[PDB]
Every structure is written in structure tokens, then in C-alpha cells.
Design a binder for these strands. Structure first.
Length: 49
DNA sequence: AAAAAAAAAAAAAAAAAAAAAAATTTTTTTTTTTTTTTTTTTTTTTT
């Protein structure tokens, strides 16, 4: 309910969700050399719950 | 001195050579980017 009720809200387990992380992870693309930041629950639910 | 004939001048039309003009997208390559994979190496877990 809290996840559905908060303006910004994400519900996740301790070990993250199915193909989603609990916290952000930064990687470097070998080809484009960009910094790809996979957003976990903590970063995705920024300013919310 | 004038008229008739001859010849020349001017002008216009036609032809030949030579310089000018017009027309003129498709096919193949290949580089970069992205993904895939094989091995090495590093980290984590277990005893």
C-alpha cells in the first residue's frame, strides 16, 4: 500500500527485483566509452519512498 | 551630245568546314557501431 500511495514509490526485496537492482551500479561501455548508470531501487525512488 | 551596249559595284542568298554546345546516376566498397564469445583472471563461498 505504501508503494502504491507514495507519489514516487518503489517496492523491492532485499536482493532487488527480477532484473532490477537495489542500488545504482556504474559501468563503462567499451564501445562508446559512456558511463551507463543502471538505476537501482534506491536511486529510482529518489525523493520518494 | 546623246543613246546603246559593256562592264563594274553593290548587295543578297547559299554552302562547307570547323569550332562550340548539350547531355550525363548507378553501383560497389568500407568504416563504424554493435553484439557475441572464449579465455583469463578476480572475487566469493566453503571447509
Amino acid at each position: 500500500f505504501v508503494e502504491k500511495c507514495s507519489p514516487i514509490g518503489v517496492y523491492t526485496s532485499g536482493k532487488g527485483s527480477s532484473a532490477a537492482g537495489l542500488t545504482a551500479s556504474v559501468m563503462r561501455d567499451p564501445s562508446s566509452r559512456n558511463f551507463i548508470m543502471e538505476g537501482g531501487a534506491m536511486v529510482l525512488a529518489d525523493g520518494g519512498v
